């Protein structure tokens, strides 16, 4: 019933930009905590950017600071990841994850979307 759907991936040239979107149904992002994850070739999945529940503070992995921006659009119940100045090292499967509003083991996860930087 709860669905996170990602879009906005594909192939881009180094130096370009992409916007990832994460659209939820059966669930409202609200002020819940959420994050964007990525799994690069040969690597474990790692957290790239997130928003806290408490105080709605954005945070970023050092490797993306100053280049990526997370934003939340309550009217659209959609969270975005704006990726600027993309590097080949950014190539990966990107995932969004959101905290459920009530008690639960586990988050809600999108399906993942491929971002390839040439
Ligand atoms: Cl928090």
Residue numbers in the entry: 1 to 118
Copy out sentences from the published article reporting this entry, exactly as the authors wrote them:
Coronavirus virions are bounded by a membrane that contains the homotrimeric transmembrane glycoprotein Spike, which is responsible for virus entry into the host cell. S1 binds the host cell receptor angiotensin-converting enzyme 2 (ACE2), whereas S2 catalyzes fusion of the viral and host cell membranes. The RBD is attached to the body of Spike by a flexible region and can exist in an inaccessible down state or an accessible up state. We isolated single-domain antibodies (nanobodies) that neutralize SARS-CoV-2 by screening a yeast surface-displayed library of >2 × 109 synthetic nanobody sequences for binders to the Spike ectodomain.
We further optimized the potency of Nb6 by selecting a saturation mutagenesis library targeting all three CDRs. Two rounds of selection identified high-affinity clones with two penetrant mutations: I27Y (Ile27→Tyr) in CDR1 and P105Y (Pro105→Tyr) in CDR3. We incorporated these mutations into Nb6 to generate matured Nb6 (mNb6), which binds with 500-fold increased affinity to SpikeS2P. mNb6 inhibits both pseudovirus and live SARS-CoV-2 infection with low nanomolar potency, a ~200-fold improvement compared with Nb6.
